[PDB]
Design a protein around this ligand. Structure first.
Ligand SMILES: Cc1c2ccocc-2oc1=O
Length: 266
């Protein structure tokens, strides 16, 4: 169907036991080192967020995606079209919050959410550390629109972490620059200025909160904030890894942690 085509949906396997959503600047390929260990036990569903470089820019409705809710509607639509009545949802970065929002509307569709590199709020205030002051964000946005290619080349090593010459850095630079520059600026603004803190107490689906100990966009205190304020049962595990896309750049240390949280309930 057109929704599935538009999001490059892939379904690997069959059966009841069953979804992985990616973060800004990448696409479903971010899961390449995780998927091989899932396909024997689960029906695996991959999809791309609207606005990813692998998607048609004509379908990027700026009003629809001006709030994270637009993306959660897309997720629910995919689940409905595939006739999935229950899934484990694994969300990277913004997709963790997209999954959370989707679970507020349709908690019946999710048995568990596993979050990788998640944050409900990036901007600091006097009683909250998200990692960024508004002035930092303003300069980032300014850099994006002034020269997108240059911004991508400087940002990718920082976001990915590790060696600046790595395959993961090269690959993230590529998917980042694959986004149309106006869409990249708009999505960046929407995400980096989001605030999901206030809805956390309303979450009912259990959540596993995982992140790298060194993450450019997610201070460790954010994981504890999520744990303290989510209304569901939750658990946190901070991984001895570097990077915002650790499942791609450091799979040997990260994949075993993600698998434990997928396979084991709280
Ligand atoms: C989520 C996220 C960010 C949030 C705020 O600033 C820079 C970021 O780079 C990212 O990948």
């Amino acid at each position: 169907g057109v929704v599935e085509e538009a999001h490059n949906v892939k379904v690997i396997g069959s059966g009841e036991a069953t979804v992985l959503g990616h973060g800004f600047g990448t696409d479903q390929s971010v899961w390449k080192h995780l998927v091989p260990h899932l396909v024997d036990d689960y029906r695996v569903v991959l999809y791309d967020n609207m606005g990813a470089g692998t998607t048609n820019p004509d379908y990027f409705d700026f009003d629809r995606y001006s709030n994270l809710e637009g993306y959660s509607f897309d997720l629910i639509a995919i689940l409905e079209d595939l006739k999935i009545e229950s899934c484990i949802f694994v969300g990277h970065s913004v997709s963790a919050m997209i999954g959370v929002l989707a679970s507020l509307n349709r908690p019946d569709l999710f048995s568990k959410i596993v979050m990788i590199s998640a944050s409900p709020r990036y901007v600091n205030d006097v009683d909250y550390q998200g990692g960024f002051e508004q002035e930092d964000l303003n300069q980032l946005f300014e850099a994006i629109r002034s020269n997108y290619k240059a911004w991508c080349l400087g940002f990718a090593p920082l976001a990915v972490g590790g060696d600046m010459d790595s395959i993961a850095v090269q690959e993230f630079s590529r998917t980042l620059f694959n986004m149309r520059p106006d869409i990249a600026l708009s999505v960046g603004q929407t995400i980096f200025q989001s605030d999901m803190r206030q809805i956390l107490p309303f979450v009912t689906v259990p959540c596993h909160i995982l992140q790298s100990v060194k993450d450019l966009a997610v201070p460790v205190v954010v994981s504890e904030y999520l744990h303290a304020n989510l209304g569901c049962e939750s658990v946190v595990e901070v991984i001895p890894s570097d990077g915002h896309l650790p499942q791609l750049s450091s799979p040997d240390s990260v994949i075993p942690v993600i698998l434990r949280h997928i396979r084991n309930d709280i």
